[PDB]
């Protein structure tokens, strides 16, 4: 079973084996058994660590139930894949991904003094094609200031920097005006409706470019693995794939008592049973008890 | 779906668009008579407007019975649809069995006949490896783990370049 | 034997989920 801080994550997830374990947990609840008390302790580092290591347990069954739109025609298959990834993110506890990476910039640059510290300590969480375009404008404003541009906002030099960072930002293709006015909010919602429309149509364009870029990478990686695979004769392919499968089976059989090796061999028995069920009735597929 | 649906016998479909199955409704104010024509069988049913509202109560909740996963089935599907692209241009190789005769032998130069025989064996090697279709089920299992490690991030699964650029501009151009 | 279930088959099989659960169960009692 669980330690009951796992099981509060698995209530809203619609994955399969989380649902089966949580239905057995609710069945044990029905027969006069009590819930365990949530430990109201484990200060913020343990809270973020356990959150990070228990959101993996909801994204990782959730990724493998998401079918890629590899080589499909149009745009809307990528929108299916990216909407299903957004739904997986909302079921694993993460927020809307824009505000999630904005939260990460708030976590990384809480205590930065100058804009050069901002472009240093957040280099990995932003594109380098944009980070170089910001470091050049940082040097350009740094030459006229002849001092580091401090991270306040009251500065005139920071305003001259931001007026060209907005310029390179709209030069990249994202309209910075609608994004700043959306996340900065307005009072009357009828005047904010159009800026929410513009932010969302950019944001839909943006996450489709994200998911389609990952799909282009998977397309090229599968094409490269196949183009290296079709150069081999079948003797090398057969002995190679049988040896690699037997090596991973021996590696997952060297571990005993651990849960992951036991579940590994259990799912190996599942795929052997699936081959037997497709062999018994090739017109209907697998036998599913209804 | 949501817990409530708001459709049924109101702006409903009236006819069929195919001849493979024919559908004729007789929708009255209280009930409806759907006499559907389908092959050699035929059914004439009776549903009311509040009888279709009892449809979406217990939801269907479809799922995909897969061999390994739905992700790995999709990558294996793409590998098979690439092997079709390769196989279609092994379908346009010229026949050489029309030139296996001994009349083309002794008119042929020895080096060029040897290179023709090695070319034919090279075609047989290509065609034997491009139709090893049982190897794709493991060939896609090397594309999966880097992809699964790229969706298992510390921030969000579907996060990437341009959304991080938009939030970087939104983070920078605000007042500090 | 045959015709297992439906919910036994919707499980994505060779996902991780259990290396991570084992890492968490040998991490958090060792880091508290």
């Amino acid at each position: 079973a669980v330690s009951k801080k796992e099981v509060l994550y698995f209530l809203s997830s619609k994955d399969a084996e989380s649902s089966t374990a949580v239905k057995s947990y609710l069945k044990s609840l029905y027969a006069g058994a009590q819930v365990e008390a949530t430990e109201t302790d484990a200060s913020e580092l343990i809270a973020q660590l356990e959150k990070k290591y228990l959101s993996a347990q909801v994204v990782e069954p959730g990724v493998h139930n998401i079918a890629l739109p590899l080589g499909e025609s149009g745009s809307a298959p990528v929108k299916r894949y990216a909407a299903e990834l957004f739904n997986l993110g909302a079921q694993a506890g993460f927020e809307c991904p824009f505000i999630e990476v904005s939260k990460k910039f708030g976590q990384e640059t809480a205590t930065s003094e100058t804009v050069k510290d901002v472009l240093n300590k957040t280099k990995s969480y932003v594109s380098a094609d944009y980070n170089a375009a910001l470091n050049e404008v940082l040097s350009s404003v740094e030459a006229e200031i002849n001092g580091p541009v401090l991270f306040d906002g009251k500065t005139e030099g920071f305003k001259k920097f931001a007026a060209k960072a907005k310029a390179v930002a709209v030069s990249r293709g994202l309209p910075a005006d609608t994004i700043l006015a959306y996340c900065a909010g307005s009072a009357n919602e009828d005047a904010a409706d159009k800026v929410s429309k513009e932010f969302f149509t950019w944001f839909e364009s943006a996450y489709t470019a994200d998911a389609a870029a990952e799909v282009k990478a998977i397309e090229a990686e599968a094409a490269s693995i196949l183009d290296r695979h079709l150069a081999k004769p079948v003797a090398q392919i057969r002995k190679e794939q049988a040896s690699a499968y037997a090596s991973l089976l021996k590696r997952a059989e060297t571990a005993k008592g651990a849960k992951w090796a036991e579940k590994y061999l259990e799912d190996v028995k599942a795929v052997q049973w699936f081959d037997a069920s497709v062999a018994e009735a090739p017109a209907s597929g697998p036998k599913v008890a209804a | 779906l949501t817990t409530f649906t708001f459709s049924g016998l109101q702006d409903a479909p009236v006819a069929a668009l195919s001849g493979s199955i024919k559908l004729n409704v007789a929708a009255k104010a209280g009930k409806a008579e759907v006499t559907v024509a389908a092959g050699a069988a035929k059914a004439a049913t009776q549903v009311s407007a509040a009888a279709l509202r009892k449809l979406s109560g217990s939801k269907i909740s479809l799922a995909e019975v897969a061999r390994i996963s739905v992700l790995h089935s999709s990558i294996q599907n793409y590998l098979l649809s690439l092997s079709n692209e390769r196989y279609q241009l092994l379908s346009q190789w010229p026949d050489f069995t029309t030139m296996y005769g001994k009349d083309f032998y002794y008119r042929a130069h020895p080096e060029d006949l040897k290179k023709f025989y090695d070319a034919a064996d090279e075609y047989y090697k290509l065609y034997e490896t491009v139709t090893e279709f049982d190897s794709l089920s493991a060939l896609a299992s090397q594309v999966v783990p880097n992809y699964a490690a790229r969706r298992r991030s510390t921030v969000h699964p579907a996060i990437g370049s341009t959304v991080a650029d938009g939030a970087f501009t939104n983070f920078l151009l605000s007042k500090q | 034997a045959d015709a297992k279930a439906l919910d036994e088959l919707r499980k994505p099989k060779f996902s991780s989920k259990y290396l991570i659960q084992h890492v968490s169960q040998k991490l958090i009692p060792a880091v508290k």
Binding site: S127, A213, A223 | - | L19
Partner: peptide, 30 residues
């Protein structure tokens, strides 16, 4: 068909490193 199970967390948000579409098809046409 089974994969090596990796449990590691990608910290960097980067472009996904598209590979080069290889020269197998031009080789087979050659």
């Amino acid at each position: 068909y089974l994969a090596p199970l990796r449990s590691d967390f990608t910290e960097e948000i980067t472009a996904p490193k598209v590979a080069s579409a290889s020269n197998l098809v031009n080789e087979w046409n050659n």
